[PDB]
Amino acid sequence: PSLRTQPSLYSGPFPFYRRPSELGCFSLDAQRQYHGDARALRYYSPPPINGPGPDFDLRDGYPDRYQPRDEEVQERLDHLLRWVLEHRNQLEGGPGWLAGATVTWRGHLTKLLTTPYERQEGWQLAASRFQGTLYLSEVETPAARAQRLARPPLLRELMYMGYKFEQYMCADKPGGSPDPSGEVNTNVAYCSVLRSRLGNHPLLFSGAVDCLNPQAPCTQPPSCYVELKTSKEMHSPGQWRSFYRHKLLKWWAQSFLPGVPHVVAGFRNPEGFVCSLKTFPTMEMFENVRNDREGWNPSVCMNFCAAFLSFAQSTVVQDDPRLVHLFSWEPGGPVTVSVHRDAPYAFLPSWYVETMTQ
Numbered sequence: 001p002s003l004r005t006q007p008s009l010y011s012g013p014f015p016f017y018r019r020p021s022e023l024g025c026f027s028l029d030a031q032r033q034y035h036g037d038a039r040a041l042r043y044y045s046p047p048p049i050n051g052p053g054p055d056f057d058l059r060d061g062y063p064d065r066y067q068p069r070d071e072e073v074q075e076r077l078d079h080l081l082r083w084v085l086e087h088r089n090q091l092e093g094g095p096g097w098l099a100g101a102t103v104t105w106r107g108h109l110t111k112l113l114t115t116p117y118e119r120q121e122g123w124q125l126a127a128s129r130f131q132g133t134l135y136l137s138e139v140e141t142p143a144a145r146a147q148r149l150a151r152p153p154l155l156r157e158l159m160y161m162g163y164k165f166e167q168y169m170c171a172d173k174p175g176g177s178p179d180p181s182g183e184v185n186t187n188v189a190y191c192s193v194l195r196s197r198l199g200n201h202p203l204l205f206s207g208a209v210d211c212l213n214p215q216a217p218c219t220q221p222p223s224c225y226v227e228l229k230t231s232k233e234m235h236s237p238g239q240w241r242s243f244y245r246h247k248l249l250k251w252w253a254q255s256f257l258p259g260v261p262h263v264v265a266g267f268r269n270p271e272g273f274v275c276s277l278k279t280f281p282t283m284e285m286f287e288n289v290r291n292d293r294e295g296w297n298p299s300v301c302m303n304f305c306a307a308f309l310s311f312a313q314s315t316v317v318q319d320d321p322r323l324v325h326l327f328s329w330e331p332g333g334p335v336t337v338s339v340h341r342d343a344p345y346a347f348l349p350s351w352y353v354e355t356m357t358q
């Protein structure tokens, strides 16, 4: 019982992917407390044209104005499940749509999308079927956990700089001035809840959103959202080519699924300053590698994701929230399955299961 991941197996036409619609949202505050509203959403506020160029110190405030989320707490699907519980009757699709859907985090689907091209980091996905619905929840691999606990200082500062970039580009109110004098607190998050469909697989997923563009042409979410990214400055065509082949694939897969149309990138120099910005429309990212022998192909990404969802659906036969089918993958191998029950892999909490049962 295994699933192959080589790109040439998935090189056919681009599958059907239904335009995502936003069903709702939720926020996590500076204490990581859930709120069923948009209080955490920030507003895109880039450097005023006809003014000084970007000149952002991404090291400013590290580490004495840094409040990092405690990554030892494994929340799994818990926050999305709370949202689903509070909106289960109000769900679209009519009677039984949820029973035919797959529920997960946007980032879990992103990892599936990139799997045919991924050569460094493996993953594990726990799957449980409950009342027809297939739930997918990532499990930290042993290697990932050891790498997290032993994170070098350079990597921890690099991670801070990406969060700090958002503080220079976003404001708490529309049209407001960004305020970098405050704290970077990575417990704070605004999450969009979206519905889509990949082939014949209905999807319900949530993803954290960086900011909202109030000046965006369309007011209908998710089309007004903006993704913010940093990357090292590049100086040669070879460096840009490596960026197109490896980094843009990850950016595309993250923003394509929720229908975020623009990624705004700040390019940081060796001293940690962002002195240039570039906008990458999600739907044009593949153009950079369309004629590249070493490029990626969104059809392969999407066809593999569809194949995995079919593979997962047919593998997970039992409707049991205590039962976990664990899907494991390492680069160059197939996705393999093992079966487990209860702790530690079981991830649907009793408060969700009991409420849905009653």
Ligand SMILES: Nc1ncnc2c1ncn2[C@@H]1O[C@H](COP(=O)(O)O)[C@@H](OP(=O)(O)O)[C@H]1O
Binding pocket: 158, 159, 160, 161, 162, 163, 165, 210, 228, 229, 230, 231
């Ligand atoms: N496992 C990880 N490895 C490297 N960077 C990570 C990371 N987890 C979080 N980050 C940080 O989270 C920030 C915000 O993510 P996102 O861009 O997806 O909104 C990232 O900024 P960058 O994306 O600019 O690197 C990065 O700094």
Ligand SMILES: [Mg+2]
Binding pocket: 208, 209, 210
């Ligand atoms: Mg983000």
Ligand SMILES: [Mg+2]
Binding pocket: 210, 227, 228, 229
């Ligand atoms: Mg971002």
